[model samples]
Target chain A: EVKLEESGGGLVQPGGSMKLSCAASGFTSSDAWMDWVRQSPEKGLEWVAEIRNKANNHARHYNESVKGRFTISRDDSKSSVYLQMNSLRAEDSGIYYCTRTYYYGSSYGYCDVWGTGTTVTVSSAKTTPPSVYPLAPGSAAQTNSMVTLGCLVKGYFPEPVTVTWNSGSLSSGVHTFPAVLQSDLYTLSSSVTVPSSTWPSTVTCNVAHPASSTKVDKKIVPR
Target chain B: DIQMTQSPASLSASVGETVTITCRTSENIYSYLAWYQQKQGKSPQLLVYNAKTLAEGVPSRFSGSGSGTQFSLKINSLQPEDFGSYSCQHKYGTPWTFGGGTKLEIKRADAAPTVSIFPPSSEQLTSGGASVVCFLNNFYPKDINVKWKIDGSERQNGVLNSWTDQDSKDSTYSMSSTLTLTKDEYERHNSYTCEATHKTSTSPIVKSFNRNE
Candidate 1:
């Protein structure tokens, strides 16, 4: 049976670039034509691009809507096809699918093989503010003679966010986790450790995200 | 439906020659144009689409270009297999329209095909009907008209024509046409005739079939 595998999709900022891939199995690139199609809430199925390589000779076609920003290519040896797009906008956010065409009767335009579509979310202009939470030094940290402050930044849009302690002055022993996406927003956590003897009288956690102009601050007064 | 007009109803060229076929649409169709090639007795294959993009497996020797109302398909260094029919279609509007086909003939010496008709076998006769086949062999250029007739009038019903086959050794072509008749019609004392016309023949080569014969 012929099968196709597509690369996973994720978030892309506005005016960003993305490259989607589709790999084929049980067939060679010379056996069929590969095409890229996308669907969005506003638009139905739209053809993005197509590519095929036979004996190292390649042919490609692009839809007029994305002709300037999209390119379709392939690797015959690996039986993989790729679609590269630049300057993506919110309108480009959708589920993109790769398909292979078959010839029957007089038509060589039938897409008979399809890959599980990958969803692309182009970051929108709408902003969602982050909720900041400051955790006091836990029992383990207190017993170890170290003050470990945890800052959780949740429900933020546009992915990029910064967590700073004491207005960025305390950078020692700080670890920040990668942002996790959930329900179209991002959540991240950061922790800072300081010696108990040198702990600040008042610890402050500042979260900066693209969603807001002013940073969010959470102050914790240790007991 | 958008009207598409193709130019040069027919052409004759040799191998290594370059040929171009043009198509014009009644209205502006942007770049939503496609080109196809139909070989003799075979299904039409896509050559190019969106005006200039070649279809999968199509050689670089073939190219399409133009936009809006006018488009053209060019075949560079034509091969022997390129001799056939070419057509253009526009997908921009409802009721898609395909242009009138342009026949591309490879310049070659014409050979008259031998026409022969065969009576239905015993097995076919026992199946409640009879099938008579007309075989034309050793033809050159692959273009020939095969017609079936009852007595003297032309017959169209229950007739099927097969795709032409080329002989590898001699480069000659062969094809067949079948005419089916009911058991009662087959039993009647009627005459069936097969007429084949080729460019090399001043008159059609004719053959007749009868149950008694």
Candidate 2:
């Protein structure tokens, strides 16, 4: 099975440069072409660049918008393709995907293999640390043996945030919702369900945001 | 560079019937053409590459032929699983192109999907952004196009779509498209609409989220 592993994209300051790598397996650089596609609020789905490495036919193509800022290249020995972009801006924050295209002779086929995308965030100068709040189990938990504990993380710049639970008991269900953008900030919520009988006396919700130097841990005592 | 032109934009065939789809290029493309099969909600699968060479694991019944601008994908005794879309592509020059796809449908009644749009929860609105989901359920024949419009204008950015999922019980399909919007955009826009275009309906099935509502 053909597989592509993409990595190396993350939070970067405005005007900074970032290099992304896509490693290919079960195929070689000569067998197909590697391409970069990105999705953002400004550009829904944009093809950044493509490169093909063949002994006789080495070819490369770039979208007009990113022609100069983006550079795409491949290394046959490493079985990987690289995309380096410079002068990143806020609008450039989005998901970057690597794809493999099959071509024959002079005809190129569609992308048949794809990699799980790497998210890129162009950070703003103003940083806001997230505020964490804990919510007790709802009334439904009173009727059942299971209780749901909730954590809300709000008002953070740069959408990426990590939520962790510090509980001695095992959780039955856990879900974290994607961050929502609000007037220049982002907010997210997470919940974990555990049996009331085995509920920890004190459960802590820990949130780690890039803007904060220290992690915020909110404690919840089940009532 | 060569432009690909495929024939019979839509095709209706039965099981065990032989079907052939043709592709003609504006200029000579030699044997550098390939054929792909794209089932509803799935990525295109390579059936034939290098003009006539079948990809590994492809059924022998599927064949590709032709050279120098003209090509055809022939399916001998089409099976139930063979009903989908077929396209031909050529890379004879810079910027490769694909022929307009041909939809291959089996003889069956077309069913329209039930379209519904769910607004963001109150908690989601607290962050000043909303994520609304448009769902299409129980659609048949598999092919459907979902589009989002805000205040009468089509919006593409911040929209993420889910893959078509098959229901094991009914073999029907379901998919969802989520549109992310800032509170400002949601409030500024009077209406947000989710339109689903299916083969069963002449017009798109539109469900709206109106600010007043």
RMSD of each: 32.8, 9.9
**TM-score top scorer:** 2
State the fraction of real interface contacts model 2 keeps. Answer: 0.06
Candidate 1 segments whose C-alpha is farther than 4 A from its true place:
A1-223, B1-12, B26-67, B81-105, B140-173, B190-192
Judge candidate 1 at residue B50 and give its lDDT.
74
lDDT of 2 by residue, B19-97 (tens): 9899998988788887777675444566887789887689999888999978988999988888887878674554655
Screening candidate 2 with a backbone cut-off below 3 angstroms (N, C-alpha, C), the clashing residue pairs are: A106-B91, A106-B92, A107-B90, A107-B91
Interface RMSD of each: 33.1, 8.5
| TM-score to true structure, per model | 0.40, 0.51
What are the per-candidate TM-scores when only chain A is compared? 0.55, 0.77
Candidate 1, residues A1-223: lDDT per residue as tens digits?
6677888577778889999988888876656778876755365345667665443544676766676898787787787888888998887878787877542333344344567777787885456878765545322222346545556565677656878888998776554555655567665656566777666557788888743664888875543
